[model samples]
Target chain A: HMKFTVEREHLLKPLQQVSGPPTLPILGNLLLQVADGTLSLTGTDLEMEMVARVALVQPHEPGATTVPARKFFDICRGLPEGAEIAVQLEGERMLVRSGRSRFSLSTLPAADFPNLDDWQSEVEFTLPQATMKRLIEATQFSMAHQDVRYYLNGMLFETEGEELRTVATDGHRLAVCSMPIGQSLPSHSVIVPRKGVIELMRMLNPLRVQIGSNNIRAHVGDFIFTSKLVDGRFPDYRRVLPKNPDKHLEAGCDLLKQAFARAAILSNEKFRGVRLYVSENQLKITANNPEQEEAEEILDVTYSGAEMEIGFNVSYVLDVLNALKCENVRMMLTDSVSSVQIEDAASQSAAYVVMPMRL
Target chain B: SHMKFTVEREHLLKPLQQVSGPTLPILGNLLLQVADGTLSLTGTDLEMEMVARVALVQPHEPGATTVPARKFFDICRGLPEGAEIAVQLEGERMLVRSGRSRFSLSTLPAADFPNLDDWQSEVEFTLPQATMKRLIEATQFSMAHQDVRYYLNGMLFETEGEELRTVATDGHRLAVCSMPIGQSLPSHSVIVPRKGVIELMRMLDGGDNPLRVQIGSNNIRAHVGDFIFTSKLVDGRFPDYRRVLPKNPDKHLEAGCDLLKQAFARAAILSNEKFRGVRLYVSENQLKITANNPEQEEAEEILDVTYSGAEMEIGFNVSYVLDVLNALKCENVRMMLTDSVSSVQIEDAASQSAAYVVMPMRL
Candidate 1:
């Protein structure tokens, strides 16, 4: 038998955060308390898992029990506000009581709860949650979607002496963002799966208080930061990045975003091709579909080079601008066949590369 | 030839009703203007039509143009708030200008737009908007959904002497509401299609606005504020809703409407998803609500009530009971039951403005 008293809000919030369990259908999730100490709730689907902790009011017996995570969480949430819940395991049944509400949920043996075992980190370092969040958002969208080259299906996390960078690409486009954190370690590279990247982004924000190296432990092949990494070599993204383009176009971020969005209204629904005509001091964005419908927008910009006309997927440019947090954007291009680079006009922290399409 | 005018977008948006149209998607809806004084915008789908009048700024030549309704409405809605739109017709194109934005749309000949002609009213009456709004809400949900019984897909509006009533049913449950009005009319009934009922509800409000309704043999028209709504009536016979009411119920239970609604909703979580059936056990002055689902989950709630007629248990679809409670505007409601197999009647404890009858289901 075990018993504990916890603030409803503290216990309910964390219990709701656990992802629905996928492995054990009968015993989806479990509650384990250490003799009226911090109550721990954990859930996993073999590939990913989440664990949350909350302090208990009092300690009596040290025991653990497993119940349906979703049902228990909902029942707790339905309880009246300012209500404190008392939980206890009576034989094979778990009893939850708060005010006039009492629920008896069937439980499975706590000994059957699974745990991750036999895993070690290759190299682990932590930085501010904000930095990690920015790194993931800037490059995650470029990851390949169910590509035959499985390695491209995940974000490539490569680290060097005091520098950490994230790179993702799907053959046609590549996005790379890097930051310098005050940590030194042997260079290492790992590809975290797509689900891991999303879960990390969601968890890292709320857990920003513990934004230290101790919280973000990395591993290879097995588990790293509450998730496992894909075991494959991401393509050499550096070889695909354009270096020192001779032609450049500078324009306001808002102006370009709105212009592209408007032109996209008439672009081909399938190809979404939009042509850009860059001249001395202006850029003309135009698109047309097979329906004989056309859209055009002209924006003033700072461009002084050989006249150039190029076509690109309208969504690609829009995605880069949406992810960037800058007042002005700069696009660098060399020729119609080569890829174009987009980044903040004043900063080099994040950059995007998109290949031009033949129009 | 050319025509142009300007008006606030909000004033025009509120009156642009969603009316269906005939073939040739290019010229689906047409906008006609008198430009005599106020600009009147009209749209029709043969079955139903909407006409709205808005104040026009700088009205020039009066003309009509046919354009797609959906795209035209979207363009007007997408514009910035408080912006006035300037519309002008040039040849076969309609140009709309506002601030820094301009849209040119292809238009067809205005004479091509269809119109429903020659309507004669059989009966006409005026009532407060709130009363008509209440009548629609109280019974609209019980209307059948795509049932083979074509007549069941609409609400029955019946008038006798000085009383106006609305009734709707989907065979399993029935809702009936009636209100006393000042006008008197010959006893008559009309089956309003579900679409017409929905549009009327969307247009009418609980405010003290006056609503005038005109009923015709095959069509009905309503005039509210500056907008006019007209719809074709369904041509079929409605089921006799009066016969469905429980006759001489032996048990009468009165309970707080809010408490009962909450308990029924909670028990519904564990009720069978397919049937949504819940058991109500009433005895003396207490009522117990219980439900069981296929997943072995069970929920039970006990409520104190005033009941002394008979001790019995009955099953009903919890959703029907909840809907009746939501449509009612009273603090307390009464439920009358006879036996386990008979229908249950529910109504506001103090007023007879609305009443509901739900058939029993075998648990």
Candidate 2:
């Protein structure tokens, strides 16, 4: 019998929970894990780091070996239930079997598995699972993917005393979440590769408390989760947060969200900013695309501040609206240029900062 | 508490089953006879009739009152556990207090209530309650809903010698099942209004045995477990089901029902959003499912199947087959068709007790 019954979900639980090597042999998989992002040229964040390591910390029941870095999905599927797969190695050859079925493929040695990362954890702390789930999915897709600057392609998980924060950006848009950790943790941060973020989102439930070491053993139903630590110094995003509040605008959250969604359908490509012109007691949002398509929506607001025209991505405004589920929201802006819009005005902890660009 | 107007819960449910082609209506006040020891509850469109019985039903107060069927339900629902309730008629209102919740609903007079068919006697048959429930749930969805052909909108329960069968068809798909009864039932058939089939399903289960079904000219009543269900029979001849099913099919393909359904669901993602047509190709032991969209995007999934017949190509609406397969929850499902244009025959691999005839789509 193969070391692990590939057919039984229990045998494959841990390996599946943790990201697998790119290919397999019995399943035509890849042994090499590649975390490549584009090289975006910005001022100081040239974040280009790649790390791979043999997950030897846990007991691994290795089956047949797979190719280094290629697609190999056809061999692992379509098998009868309780099929006993057999595997044997002959030099570079790998044999696999299930009941009366048997097949063999070429093998690779364990020594060739790629090195994942080089950094080590300097400090460690814990955050509430509820906040983590929201932080991850909220800024999940915003993380740059295959960007010119490879470092921007991953998410930054930072920890400090009584606070754990996550930040993600894609040049034009940035999403950040910071929550008090209750206890002090090591002062350090790491960049989780894009693939790692995805696997974490699927495996981690932020509603429950999670214990942390270099590794965590979480049982999600029948499966177990064990992942390698991400190792890149994350930037301190507190510099982008604003201290002054702008216009104190109060409006129904659903109405504002729906208006932006309808207007976003006409927003331009690349720069999909929806300009909100707040004057007296009215808030007018205008969107115009490259094709000269324009959509304008006006909502009654209770704002008495001087009229200021500020621009934001229609999607960004909609995102904020969706994240805050209350019936009404309080948007406090200081000015067109320096004012920061704070949503969920009642909750001082969970807030956002949207940088405005010229319309 | 005003007064007690007592009737068996079954008596209140019986006539409610026959009100056809309607969402649970505001069941008008029929009669609540707390004095005569009879619940001659009546529900009708004047074309069909149903009557139910509750024996030795005692009402603490002597009165005739009308109450909303559903509102009455809410009052009884909150009654204290195992506590007999006293329903009192206070003026034009029905006052009911049970446990912590009390309800007051507007009422109508019993003098204006309609009349239910007073039956002398009826022909009866005994069958497993579960057998009846399965036949109805499996086929009722196929019954014509709001169809111009009114007779096609219900199930036909037929008895011949010792065989009892229930059949339903909506021009596009038809389902039929036959169960052998222990004793011979009169060679007669009854067309049960669609609403009755639904209420009867909720009242019976497989574990319920020694169930008796009484079929009269105007109504049918079933005694199963605690509930006595009655329905108005549709006064029309049901189309002969045997003539609708084909004798044999030329092509046969047997595959894992769940796997085939998943493949079809994935393939449907790219199919024309409006047409929902998927092509099936069978050659030797291989079966390929293909669907394409107006955007020229396509999906193809291949799986192993037991098919030795000549290669055949056919088009089908994926939703039809998938729905029935999901409902049946059987391991293996088989489909037999003569050609792309003919209706297909689908059946289970092991039970072999039911079969469905469905129209094929033209690609």
Candidate 3:
């Protein structure tokens, strides 16, 4: 079973979409799949890995086998762009012959490779992929980290026929957003794990169709992704938000974020906490840490509502606002005691929550 | 206010490596100066300072001491090749030393040097340079790293007449090496902390002359060739470690050090991440290594050996095995075990140089 090919770009295209090839047995798919790859890399015993460069390669025939995936990717990553790649397969072995570099590897039956699916069964949808992509980018900051509550450790995607909603909350702060779907599907939601969300974000391009099935198929490019969904359901975040806030405030997001970042340096490690006080004509923000250090920033506001105060982790609020990349943001809170809804008014979609700490 | 000194390039480097890793930016640059020609280098901080004598018999000028030591080395190390070098005293602040190669350095006042002569004047002893060097190499592996009981963190230098000994005990296990020295001082005994011993070893390789040791009120200084080494003795008393050396090691086996290290390194790949150790089982003529992690993944390797004894099991940190063999560069080694209940002693047959005692850990 020997075959040959010359499309170096063909092998290079799929690498970014997959990590490495899976382990395999005889037929040497494990080695050949990597041997045919464009880059050749090696891993050090010290965990320091390296990729090497090779010149034009002309394989005697088309050969495919599997070798360690990460190592293969690393090797290919080093190959010169558009270098002629030669692949030779002999029975269950793949001899990767390229220029001065020749790597002999064991392979397995290629037929055994699990079906790499392209989600045809999933609803065909198109959003200016940019829309959902941007929202995910905006709200991704609040995604629950590796917390004890396993269910909170992922992002939530809610699709309601016309609008796409993405939310992430790490308990301390919440980031939520709604974007135009451009197309509709059965009203449903999916929980994407931290890795899934991050990998997806890295792979997504603005204009592409980011198609996926609930749990069955997640197709970004030629490669497919599959992950275990968090069994616990998300809360009805809408109900938790205040319906009508007495005061509406507006200020430069960057100005506010910078003030807090510097202030955070002096704050105690545990409680770099801040309080925002809203009144008739102005918004005053104050933060303090255990070190008896304090930082304050004051700016103008739009509405003259009853004065109230609320506390929050300065870093949490700063993270969301920084990720949103907005000129200014508006916040609505019924009172200092209730959960406040911070949103982008111009867009009216991205929203976040920062639970008040009892000062 | 400026003084000049000349020392071997690497001899000076050896001491800094003992104190800390290279991350400290301040340690990289030292202030070097030359006055009458005698070269003295100084390194210090708020708590402790180190001064060294790079004395040479060449025609020289008597100079004083000064600032940071590292900055001066940087300039000299990069100079072009030449034998005889000259140090020209400059204005109020700096001095330049240039050989066939050129090296000039910024200067600092010698007055800032901490009273470096801190050794006790009464008691001292000497050992073959090779002996002291090997002793430090043997025990550094088990020193109590940053432990709360800080005193157990260094090597205790014990001596009697022409014989000298070094021991390190980190509570769990201890490593000791003994050597016979011909040179004699007033007396012999001192707990040379881990850092000092390691630094001193780097300065004196086997070929160097027998080291001349001087004991002052608080510091211990050793002079070898063109280099002078000094260290502050630990304040706390060290435990007596000779009692821990087993009189009879129940099982003694000779095995290729390379093969043993390789087997353990591979098995360690899957060891429980938290412990990062693998278990070794020994039975007549065979050795088995097993490592399993929380993921239920296991890496096992069984190798042939020259041991015939009761089946015994012991666990070791993979890092310890890697460091010892990697550093010792021995072709073959012997392991003496006491039924797996006690520490395992590893010795090099060819070098007969250094030995490491590692406590058996539970996997």
Error of 3 at A226 (Å): 24
TM-score of chain A of each: 0.91, 0.70, 0.79
Question: For this target, which candidate reaches the highest DockQ against the unseen true structure?
Answer: 1
Query: What CAPRI-style quality would you assign to candidate 3?
Result: incorrect
Chain A of candidate 2 compared with the true chain A, TM-score: 0.70
| Model 1 per-residue lDDT tens digits across residues A1-359 | 77777667877657765643344564475556545466777776666667776766665557788876876786666655677888888877777766544556667777777765545556756677678888999999999889999888889888889978999999888999999878786677778778777777665512221111112333221112366678787888788788769999999998788778767766788999999999998898888777554556778999998999999999998999998878999999999889999999999999999998998
Instruction: Write down the lDDT that model 1 would get.
Output: 0.78
True contacts kept of each: 0.00, 0.00, 0.00
User: For every model shown, what is its TM-score relative to the native structure?
Assistant: 0.83, 0.52, 0.48
Off by over 4 Å in 2: A1-126, A130-359, B1-31, B35-59, B79-84, B99-103, B118-123, B225-227, B235-237
Docking quality level of the chain pair in candidate 1: incorrect
Every model: iRMSD: 3.4, 19.8, 18.7
Report lDDT (CA) for all predictions.
0.78, 0.61, 0.59
Model 2, range A1-359, lDDT digits (tens) per residue? 11222342222333333324212232223342211221110000012111122222222244433331221122233334454433344456444445433334444554543323334434544445556677687667557788777667777776767777777876665677777758777665666667656655665532322334343222334333334444444445666666667468888888787667656655776877788899888888877766444556778878898888888877767777787777778887876665355467456555656767677
- Residue A291 C-alpha lDDT in model 1: 51
Query: Looking at model 1, what is the TM-score of chain A?
Result: 0.91
Predicted candidate 1 versus true structure: per-residue lDDT over B199-272, tens digit per residue:
87888854688988999999989899888889999999999888889989878999999878867876676678
